[PDB]
Every structure is written in C-alpha cells, then in structure tokens.
C-alpha cells in the first residue's frame, strides 16, 4: 500500500553521520566502479545508494577518459546504504547519463535519460520494466534532478529541463502514477535558471532548492503540490550559498531576483536547504571559489526575511579537502514510526583529473547524515584516499 508523505518535516538541531562508502579507499584493490555522481533514496524497507557508473572499474584501463560525463556506457545501479559501490553487489536499475529514482510504497521508479546530445530521451522504469518515454522538446541536453524524486499519495514527481546551460532554458514539472506520466507543467521563470534541484515533501507540498547556473549567486526555490500549481522565486537568505560567491558581508540577497556578482555568473554547484518554520538549514562549501569543505547553517528567518543571523553552524569537511554535489532526502514514517518526516542529506567528495591533474580517472565517494533533535558536533569525515593510483603510474 502506497506510501504517504502528507506529513510535516521534522525540526532538527544537528546532523549526525549515518554512512560512508569508503569507495575509493576500498577500490584501490577491490572491484569498485567509477562514479561521477551518487545519491540516496529510501523505501519502506531500506535506503539505497544510487549512482551513475561509467561502465568501468578503478585501476582498470577502461577508466582512462572518465572525465567525460556523457557517453553510451553509463548506467544507474543501486547498492544498499553504506556498502561500497562494488561490482558484485550493485543491482542494475537503468541505462542513463542523468537520472532520478524513488520508491512509491509498492515498487522503485527510476528515470534514465539516454540518447545523443541533440535528441535525448528519458525512459521511466517501474519495478524493472520500461513503462513510458519522454523526449526532448528544445532538443538540447535533457536533464533530470540528480537526486531522488518525491512521491506523495502514490504519485511521484520530478523536475526536468531542456535548453542552454549559461542562458535561459525550459523547465517542466512531471507527475506519474504506476510508472507512466499523467501530467506535465512548464515553469515560466524569465529571470533565472533551475537546473539540478534537490526536493523533499513537506506537509503536502513538494519543496525544491535548485541551482542557478546563470546570473546568480543564490538558490532558486520551486514549490508545487498535488495538481502542479507552483510558486517560483529565490531563497531569501542574506547568506549566499552557491559555490562562486562574494563573502557574506558583501552580498545583499533577494527573494525575487537573481543576484549576480564579479566572476560568479556562469557556474555553480548542486545543494540543498531544509525549511524549518521560517528558518533554513542551508548547506554550502566552505571556500567561496572552489568545491572544498562543507558547512550546514541554520539561518534565522532565512526562508523569507533577507536575514544574516546564523544561529548554528556545523562543519563536516574541513577546507583542505575536496567536496562536490549535495542533496536532500527524507526517511519516512514506515521506518521511524515518528509522526513526521526525518530530514537527511548526502555529500559527495570528488577526486581525479578536474583538480588532481596527474590522475587519469575521476570518481567520487558519498557520506550521509541525518537530523537529530539533540545538538551534535562536527568533524572532518573526508574520503582518505592516497592518489596517484597504480593505473596513474
């Protein structure tokens, strides 16, 4: 019987660690896949680490050109929360070079995009069989949100986008019942860019905090409900949270307009932001110009009020260590028996040629945290690999 999520998000006071792949550290001898980006999604029986493999293993020669992020060899597989992404325990889910997945209470839905750049298409798997297809409409790179979809009263929702990267695109909200699509509505938003959202249900509205890849330092917000009416805007906080940004004292913030900066306008990184009344637990990378470190900030009235008052801060990586994408998910009632949804987040740490020029491959490793009503401290749970590897020699 279908999984409800018409229940409020839990108030949390600190985030405690839950799992750590150690993928690259084990992969130096073990049979482990090359992954550019992972994510996590939770069913009623377990939570599973999804990831987009690159069809090759670490230290194997077929890992050579794995900086290339779109190819016919990538596939979405899935491993239970915390186990390394190894070759023998990974259950195949989709063929895909950009996907999303989530469990509706009966069976696991996964959306895998494939096909050539100018003519891509998405295949919607449901319990291991392709039930539907969605083709491009502007006939540039089609994308889903690189983290779980949001299921409510048995319908599962997600955002997709087609069009340019450094300029205004087209964005659409989708809705499925037992695989196949039943609704689709376009986001008219002339001032900005909603690429790579991180979404969670909250008391019957799906909330998403996305990635402004054009003229912005600040997160776009999208909020929509049962029959896809929506509100679009920006995370009001007075504290900027994208990767390229000017320091907190220089930024002014806006609720409705993209706020741009000196050299910050054409780039970003995937993040998250849990609303807690009117405050927000906003995650961001410690450095203001590179993907390193990670903070979680509780900004008072940051969801509505251009405030800069950071009430709490945690750190989960220190600034000497490389990081990457981050996203949201929630652990349902079926697991915890709480009368509310527990908010969790994941963090990937990338290693390889985009910054460590001497290694030929590029892979990443996941860490997962969940909210706790008690206060919790921080520490640097970094990936601990020792590059170069034996295939880089």
């Amino acid at each position: 019987e279908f999984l409800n999520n018409t229940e409020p998000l839990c108030n949390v006071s600190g985030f405690a660690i839950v799992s750590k792949d150690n993928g690259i550290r084990i992969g130096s001898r073990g049979h482990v896949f090359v992954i550019r980006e992972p994510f996590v999604a939770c069913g009623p029986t377990e939570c599973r680490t999804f990831f987009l493999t690159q069809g090759a293993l670490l230290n194997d020669k077929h890992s050579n050109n794995t900086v290339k992020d779109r190819s016919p060899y990538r596939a979405l597989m899935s491993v239970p929360l915390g186990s390394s992404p190894n070759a023998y325990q990974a259950k195949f889910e989709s063929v895909a070079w950009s996907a999303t997945a989530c469990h509706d209470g009966k069976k696991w839905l996964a959306v895998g995009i494939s096909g050539a750049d100018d003519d891509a298409y998405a295949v919607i798997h449901y319990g291991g069989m392709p039930t539907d297809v969605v083709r491009s409409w502007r006939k540039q790179i089609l994308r889903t949100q690189e983290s779980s979809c949001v299921c409510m009263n048995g319908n599962c929702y997600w955002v997709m986008t087609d069009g340019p990267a450094n300029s205004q695109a087209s964005y659409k909200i989708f809705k499925s019942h037992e695989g196949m699509v039943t609704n689709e509505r376009e986001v008219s938003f002339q001032g900005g860019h909603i690429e790579e959202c991180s979404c969670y249900p909250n008391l019957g509205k799906v909330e998403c905090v996305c990635r402004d890849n054009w003229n912005g330092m600040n997160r776009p917000i999208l909020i929509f409900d049962e029959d896809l009416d929506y509100e679009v805007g920006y995370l009001c906080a007075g504290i900027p949270t994208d990767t390229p940004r000017v320091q907190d004292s220089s930024f002014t913030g806006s609720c409705t307009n993209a706020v741009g900066g000196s050299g910050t306008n054409n780039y970003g990184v995937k993040g998250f932001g849990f609303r807690q009344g009117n405050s927000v637990w906003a995650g961001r990378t410690v450095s203001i110009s590179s993907r390193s470190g990670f903070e979680i900030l509780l900004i008072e009235d940051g969801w509505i009020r251009t405030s800069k008052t950071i009430v709490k801060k945690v750190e989960v990586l220190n600034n000497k260590n490389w990081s990457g994408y981050s996203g949201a998910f929630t652990i349902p009632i079926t697991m915890t028996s709480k009368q509310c949804l527990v908010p969790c987040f994941w963090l990937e740490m990338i290693r390889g040629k985009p910054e460590e020029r001497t290694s030929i491959w590029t892979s990443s490793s996941s860490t997962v945290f969940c909210g706790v009503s008690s206060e919790v401290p921080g520490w640097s749970w970094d990936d601990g690999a020792i590059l170069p590897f034996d295939i880089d020699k």
Partner: antibody
Amino acid sequence: LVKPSETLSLTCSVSGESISSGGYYWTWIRQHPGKGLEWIGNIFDTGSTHYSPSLKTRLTISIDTSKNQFYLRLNSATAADTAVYYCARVGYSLETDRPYYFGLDVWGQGTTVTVSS
Amino acid sequence: DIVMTQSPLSLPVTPGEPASISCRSSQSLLHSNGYTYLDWYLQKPGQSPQLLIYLASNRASGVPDRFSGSGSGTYFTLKISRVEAEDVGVYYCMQAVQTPWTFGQGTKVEIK
C-alpha cells in the same frame, strides 16, 4: 567596395530566433578567393568576446540586442582582406557539469568584400 | 594555433561506391573536459558551408544517413557509405579546442 586603409564594417541580422535566445555565440568567418576558410571572432549574447590573434589589433565586434543585429568593424583594411565574409551562430559551453557543442549549425549568405581603388 | 592537414587535396569518386576523407592535427584534440572538438563542413558549388559532423563521431540534424565519422587523438576520418550525386563539393575539417579555431585545407570531391 572598400578602398585601402579605410575602415571596413558589416551588418548581420537575426530572425525567427532573437539575440539573447538559445545562448549561442555569434561568429564571423572569412574566405579568400580560391583558399580555405578562416575564423575571425566570437561574441556572446552578453557581449563577452573572443578574437583571432592575427586580426586582434584591427578588429572591433559588437551586438545590439534591441535590433537583433551584430556587427564587424575592421580598421585599416588591406587589399589582402578581400574575401567573402560569412556570419554564423554556434551553441556551446565549457563551464557547466554537462558541457555541449553544436558547431556552427546555421550560416548566413556571404558578402563579397573587395578592397581596392 | 593547431595546424590542420588533410590528405587528399582532390578525391576522384563515382556514385554508388564508398569513399573516404581523413584529417590530422598538430596536437591531440582531446580537450581537458574529455570531449574531442572536431567537425566536418561541406561547401557545395556556389553556396555557404554546411554542417556534417559536429564532434569527432556525431552527425548533425538533417544530414543524410549516409555519412559516418571516426577517430581520436590526432587522426580523424569521414566515411561515405554510398556516394550520390548531391555530394559534390569541398570538404573542410575544423577544430574548436583552442581560442583560435582553424579549418583544414579543403578536399575537393570530383565525380569520375
């Protein structure tokens, strides 16, 4: 016709699309009689520019988004600057985590600039 | 700049048979973001150029299904599976790796 050491300039226009739609880079491209192609330079919709080094001292390239037009100016034109001049569009981007490139997919008709007295 | 060189300066051909043209660059075209930025363009008699192939391997939209591309590193190839009377023209390669883009010398195709 253009006489030597004058300032050459040319106008190219866009339609169906608009400038500042689709995020293309607008390009100028040359062809001397009997020879192969050459590349002059790129403008982005928001005015950021790339130039070929051999012509960088001579050139100035600009958009006007209110007119859906974009422009080439070439100072001190020599007789050797005689060519067919083409203007094109090309969509690509290298920053993002999902790069793309759809090379010079649309070309306008050529203008046969003759630089002589 | 990348210096571009392209081996047949004229290629005699005749409808119905396969044909090939090939290209070599003075540095490898493998960009740091993993993609290989090489194109082929076709200029028919009294016309502008036209796009055939927009990265090493990929055909453009609207191009007839008869063309094919291959190669990596420095050496690239254009394949025509069957040549037909609409294929006469001058074929240029191009590279888009560096800040100055450079075109090849231009293989003429002459029916025999």
